[PDB]
Amino acid sequence: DDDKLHSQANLMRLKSDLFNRSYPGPTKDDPLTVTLGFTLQDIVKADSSTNEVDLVYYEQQRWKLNSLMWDPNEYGNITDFRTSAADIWTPDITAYSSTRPVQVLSPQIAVVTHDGSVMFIPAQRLSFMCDPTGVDSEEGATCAVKFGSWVYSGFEIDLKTDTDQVDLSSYYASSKYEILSATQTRQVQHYSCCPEPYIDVNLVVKFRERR
Amino acid sequence: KLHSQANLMRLKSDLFNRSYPGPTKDDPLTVTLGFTLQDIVKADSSTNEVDLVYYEQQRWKLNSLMWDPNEYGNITDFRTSAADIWTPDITAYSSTRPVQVLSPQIAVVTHDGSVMFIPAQRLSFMCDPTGVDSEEGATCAVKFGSWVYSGFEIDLKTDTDQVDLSSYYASSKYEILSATQTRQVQHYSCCPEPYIDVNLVVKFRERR
Amino acid sequence: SQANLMRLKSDLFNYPGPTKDDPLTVTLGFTLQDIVKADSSTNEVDLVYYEQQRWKLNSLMWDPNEYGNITDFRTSAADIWTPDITAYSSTRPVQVLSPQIAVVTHDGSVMFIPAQRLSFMCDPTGVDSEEGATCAVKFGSWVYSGFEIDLKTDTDQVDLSSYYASSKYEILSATQTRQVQHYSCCPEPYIDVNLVVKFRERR
Amino acid sequence: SQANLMRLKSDLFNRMYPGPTKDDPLTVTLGFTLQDIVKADSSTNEVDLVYYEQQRWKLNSLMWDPNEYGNITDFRTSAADIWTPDITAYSSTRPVQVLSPQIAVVTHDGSVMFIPAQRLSFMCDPTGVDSEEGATCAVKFGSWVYSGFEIDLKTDTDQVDLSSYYASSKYEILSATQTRQVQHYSCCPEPYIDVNLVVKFRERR
Amino acid sequence: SQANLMRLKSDLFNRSYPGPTKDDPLTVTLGFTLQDIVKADSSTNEVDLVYYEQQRWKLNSLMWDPNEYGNITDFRTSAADIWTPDITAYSSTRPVQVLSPQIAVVTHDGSVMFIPAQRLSFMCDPTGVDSEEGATCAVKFGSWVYSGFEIDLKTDTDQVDLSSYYASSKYEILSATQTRQVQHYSCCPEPYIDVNLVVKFRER
Numbered sequence A: 001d002d003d004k005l006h007s008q009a010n011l012m013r014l015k016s017d018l019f020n021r022s023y024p025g026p027t028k029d030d031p032l033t034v035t036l037g038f039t040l041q042d043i044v045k046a047d048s049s050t051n052e053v054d055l056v057y058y059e060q061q062r063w064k065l066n067s068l069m070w071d072p073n074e075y076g077n078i079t080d081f082r083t084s085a086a087d088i089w090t091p092d093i094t095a096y097s098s099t100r101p102v103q104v105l106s107p108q109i110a111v112v113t114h115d116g117s118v119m120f121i122p123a124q125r126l127s128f129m130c131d132p133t134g135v136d137s138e139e140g141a142t143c144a145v146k147f148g149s150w151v152y153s154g155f156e157i158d159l160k161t162d163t164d165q166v167d168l169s170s171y172y173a174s175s176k177y178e179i180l181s182a183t184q185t186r187q188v189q190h191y192s193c194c195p196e197p198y199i200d201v202n203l204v205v206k207f208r209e210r211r
Numbered sequence B: 001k002l003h004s005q006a007n008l009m010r011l012k013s014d015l016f017n018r019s020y021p022g023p024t025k026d027d028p029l030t031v032t033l034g035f036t037l038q039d040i041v042k043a044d045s046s047t048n049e050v051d052l053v054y055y056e057q058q059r060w061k062l063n064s065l066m067w068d069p070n071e072y073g074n075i076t077d078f079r080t081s082a083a084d085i086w087t088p089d090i091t092a093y094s095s096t097r098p099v100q101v102l103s104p105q106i107a108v109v110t111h112d113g114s115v116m117f118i119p120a121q122r123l124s125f126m127c128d129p130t131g132v133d134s135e136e137g138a139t140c141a142v143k144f145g146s147w148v149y150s151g152f153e154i155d156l157k158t159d160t161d162q163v164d165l166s167s168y169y170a171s172s173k174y175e176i177l178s179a180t181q182t183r184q185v186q187h188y189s190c191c192p193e194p195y196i197d198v199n200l201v202v203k204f205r206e207r208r
Numbered sequence C: 001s002q003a004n005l006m007r008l009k010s011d012l013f014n015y016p017g018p019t020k021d022d023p024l025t026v027t028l029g030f031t032l033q034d035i036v037k038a039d040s041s042t043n044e045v046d047l048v049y050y051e052q053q054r055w056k057l058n059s060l061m062w063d064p065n066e067y068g069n070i071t072d073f074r075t076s077a078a079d080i081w082t083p084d085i086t087a088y089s090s091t092r093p094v095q096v097l098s099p100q101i102a103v104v105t106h107d108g109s110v111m112f113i114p115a116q117r118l119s120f121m122c123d124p125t126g127v128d129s130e131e132g133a134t135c136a137v138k139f140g141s142w143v144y145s146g147f148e149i150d151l152k153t154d155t156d157q158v159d160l161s162s163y164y165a166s167s168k169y170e171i172l173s174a175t176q177t178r179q180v181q182h183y184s185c186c187p188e189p190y191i192d193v194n195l196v197v198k199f200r201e202r203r
Numbered sequence D: 001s002q003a004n005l006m007r008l009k010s011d012l013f014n015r016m017y018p019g020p021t022k023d024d025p026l027t028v029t030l031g032f033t034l035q036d037i038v039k040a041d042s043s044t045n046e047v048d049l050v051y052y053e054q055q056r057w058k059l060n061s062l063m064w065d066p067n068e069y070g071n072i073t074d075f076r077t078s079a080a081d082i083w084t085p086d087i088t089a090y091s092s093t094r095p096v097q098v099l100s101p102q103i104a105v106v107t108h109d110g111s112v113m114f115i116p117a118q119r120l121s122f123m124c125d126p127t128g129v130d131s132e133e134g135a136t137c138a139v140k141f142g143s144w145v146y147s148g149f150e151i152d153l154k155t156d157t158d159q160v161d162l163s164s165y166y167a168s169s170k171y172e173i174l175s176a177t178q179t180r181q182v183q184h185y186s187c188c189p190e191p192y193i194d195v196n197l198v199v200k201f202r203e204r205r
Numbered sequence E: 001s002q003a004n005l006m007r008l009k010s011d012l013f014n015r016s017y018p019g020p021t022k023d024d025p026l027t028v029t030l031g032f033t034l035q036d037i038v039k040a041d042s043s044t045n046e047v048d049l050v051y052y053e054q055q056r057w058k059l060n061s062l063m064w065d066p067n068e069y070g071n072i073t074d075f076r077t078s079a080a081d082i083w084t085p086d087i088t089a090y091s092s093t094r095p096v097q098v099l100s101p102q103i104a105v106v107t108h109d110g111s112v113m114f115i116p117a118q119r120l121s122f123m124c125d126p127t128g129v130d131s132e133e134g135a136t137c138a139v140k141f142g143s144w145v146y147s148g149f150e151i152d153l154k155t156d157t158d159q160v161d162l163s164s165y166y167a168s169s170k171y172e173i174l175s176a177t178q179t180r181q182v183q184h185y186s187c188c189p190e191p192y193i194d195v196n197l198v199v200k201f202r203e204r
């Protein structure tokens, strides 16, 4: 009950050291790479009257800041902590073809590790632009939606995925829709309009009515 | 009475302007979870969503919240807003829509440092209701647990294997065949932490 | 006189809820305005009503004589404690239709009357018959036991003087009744006001 | 310019009107501009309107003299910055949805103009809408918590402004009026004042 | 450098805009990028449009010398933290739904660029959308509270950007125009400015 009082005291001081003394977001001089991963849980609805499809997925977001690092030794072997997302800067990762505000299904809480890495995994329901024509056929339908920063250019936020394969191991086994394939791919595009690169992660999902 | 009010504000002030940042590997917390199913409102076989109304009883206990009632005018408990205290981030793992909260976000803290919080909710979750119009009915399942704490920081426990059905609405469109809540612990090659959840399985069918 | 009002509000504000030794009695009453919807596919009924709430606090007494003949004021419900009155068989969050503003009287009584839309559990079978349908929903505190909060009605007649004359549904009767319940599981009384409405398709 | 304005506001907002009282009652003028009858639902007896509600009142505690403030005669301010009346429809079926910025104009004479655009669902039986006669519905507007002892209401005209009514609405407008009324109930000594919005309308042809 | 930015932000905000006035009017630039007509409801005559508005204005109190601040030329700030123009649709039938983060980019010249993505329901008779010639609807945008003496609204370009319009929408766009309109009304000596967006569209 004195180890425990002492360990709490260490956590509160770490959080005050990082949060109260000592983040404006990335700049071209100090750019940030966010690692993104999708875990598709369900294609919930495919609306052929409006060409909207609703997905439920988790989005794992990961980045690393020097100003969040600390030494576990000065803070009682604390190697990580949970904190509300409002306590830290988080990337404005946004779907570029959503048709309604994304609905958050999970607690807005992040895990900060001693080397400055942050991991934040919002579960979400998204309506996005998609013609589901062909979903009732063997070859199925294909849709795509890009994710990336809304306001930071490619000189300030970069992105990558650890694999092209969307994680399907939690995909709902009785969904109305069967997944034929689902890929997530970093894409850098150059436009003449603009000297900065446009970076996004493209999520391509091919699916059909479960038979 | 004007005195008991004085003692309540003082207790609160002592507990809340003196010194709890959430559980850690060094200071883990056991959350006891129990479900009371009130209604299955809707089963949608076009999207495989089912809507439940249920109560989620959450209980945990902290040293930082204990007091001696003798020192505070015999006060043995008090109510406080859930924003005022740490609460566990218990979450359904296969919801299809944000849960809608039906009850006041206020908890009851007891002098032994136990907290009870009972959010009533309507939840849409993933569920194929095929067979609901048959004798055998349909079965669905949804896992609840911490979103961000592993089994190293929050352990979950049930007080019973049975979901409380005694308040189930007797004129629901659906009748309950069985409703159980089973703690489960799981490990993955990738990761060293245990993951703990409570699996809510409900078998149900169209009322006769 | 505006002078006088700010000074009273000044004096009074500068109440953390009831306790077992300082309990609170809340008076409830309902003004049924409309049965807007009765969905027989889900057994949900939607009602629009005013939830009349009143309680009295020692804290809020004053002399209309020490303050320019000011017998009452209005204040945002957000500046004051209000009881956590909740339906016990809603299916959706309640939607509030009116400003959240309370009226405090010099006798220390607070009146707060939100108009609200509520979906609750109700089988409307029989609504297209002469006998019509009958549904019930109970209201009461969610987090205060009957040791800290008690309830009462001023009358058992639901106020129907504002019932919408052209609703799809006519009201055959509507009663509001304080209930006290005891259960073996639990050592506090369960107190609530039960609203029972009998109604049928208008003809 | 901005120094004068930032001073004005600091002065007015730092030297708060606690609402009207019986001793100092307030008159609020209301008028409606009806834009559209968006939907009429005959299964639930709910009609939806989109309108602008012009509210206007006048406080002594919001007067200033322009020459002490660089010839400023008016300013725009967030409506959460000032008291605004709790004007409410008495028979809505869904929370009212606000379609415009919650910003008011204060003028040097202490008068305030606030004009929220709103969408409103309200209790209305649309029977007869598919006929030449049309349907008729009414909704009353007034203060939720102030009786006629603290808030009096008025209109400048009892004709609803239809000059902006949408030309290709599903529903044509036959007439629309806004009438101040004073009610006295046996229960209560206070007068209750409202503006009654009555609309007749039919399916456009 | 992370510190140069953390100081620039201090100087501008927590060390000093009550919006525009008749003596200090603001020019605001508006342009539309249309992304999807999602739905046209002929039972209620509403159409739902997903689109972006590019807003741009320049303020003196947002000027700074780059070489006094680490060669920082621009930054990103939350739109809640700066004044932003009250640009509103004059005939929407439901509150706007915001699809993107509400973050503006401020440049050293004091210019501000803000690009909200939104879904907007507005009044629109879709009669004709199932025929070769389509249906035509219009929606005007402008300040709700500031006349043309306080906010002077202009288009950035004369053209609606259709380059990112979703190719597999239920509805094809046959044309879309954006045009600044000035009107004098008899209540008031001030000019009133809006930008009218006119869209002709039909079922794909």
Ligand SMILES: COc1ccc2cc1Oc1cc3c(cc1OC)CC[N+](C)(C)[C@H]3Cc1ccc(cc1)Oc1c(OC)c(OC)cc3c1[C@@H](C2)[N+](C)(C)CC3
Pocket: A096, A097, A146, A148, A149, A150, A151, A191, A193, A194, E033, E052, E054, E115, E163, E164
């Ligand atoms: C200068 O502006 C742009 C440059 C380039 C494009 C759009 C542009 O339009 C805008 C983009 C963006 C914003 C505002 C825009 O206008 C005011 C704000 C937010 N960011 C900066 C993040 C992007 C977000 C963003 C939004 C739309 C977008 C790409 C990025 O559109 C595209 C697609 O996705 C829908 C797509 O997918 C298959 C394929 C293509 C495009 C666009 C790409 N076109 C057609 C040109 C080529 C092919």
Ligand SMILES: COc1ccc2cc1Oc1cc3c(cc1OC)CC[N+](C)(C)[C@H]3Cc1ccc(cc1)Oc1c(OC)c(OC)cc3c1[C@@H](C2)[N+](C)(C)CC3
Pocket: B036, B055, B057, B118, B166, B167, B168, C088, C089, C138, C140, C141, C142, C143, C183, C185, C186, C190
């Ligand atoms: C220990 O728990 C309970 C004990 C007793 C009951 C419910 C219980 O379940 C809960 C009740 C309550 C809470 C949480 C509960 O679970 C953890 C939190 C909020 N309070 C404390 C305020 C009540 C709110 C409340 C909620 C449900 C409720 C009664 C009160 O259900 C009933 C009815 O209304 C739905 C009803 O109507 C005819 C008739 C009856 C009941 C219940 C009463 N049964 C069936 C048992 C007997 C008859």
Ligand SMILES: COc1ccc2cc1Oc1cc3c(cc1OC)CC[N+](C)(C)[C@H]3Cc1ccc(cc1)Oc1c(OC)c(OC)cc3c1[C@@H](C2)[N+](C)(C)CC3
Pocket: C029, C052, C054, C101, C102, C103, C111, C112, C113, C161, C162, D090, D142, D143, D144, D145, D185, D187, D188, D192
């Ligand atoms: C917060 O305060 C109120 C909020 C809302 C209203 C009155 C209010 O004020 C009082 C209510 C009450 C009292 C005193 C009040 O203020 C000193 C004394 C006792 N109770 C607590 C029981 C109610 C009883 C009560 C008294 C008056 C009353 C409604 C209920 O007024 C109305 C009507 O009936 C007269 C009526 O009839 C068709 C229609 C309407 C109203 C009122 C309702 N408006 C205009 C707003 C809407 C339409």
Ligand SMILES: COc1ccc2cc1Oc1cc3c(cc1OC)CC[N+](C)(C)[C@H]3Cc1ccc(cc1)Oc1c(OC)c(OC)cc3c1[C@@H](C2)[N+](C)(C)CC3
Pocket: D033, D052, D054, D115, D163, D164, D165, E090, E091, E140, E142, E143, E144, E145, E185, E187, E192
């Ligand atoms: C003084 O009162 C008004 C005078 C003039 C009009 C509306 C009026 O109603 C109001 C307008 C406005 C407000 C409040 C109003 O009421 C108190 C708040 C602030 N702004 C400045 C934003 C306008 C916003 C505004 C709102 C509606 C509006 C025009 C402007 O309606 C019109 C249109 O479509 C929206 C349209 O295009 C098809 C064409 C026309 C109109 C109107 C213009 N008529 C028919 C008369 C002429 C041509």
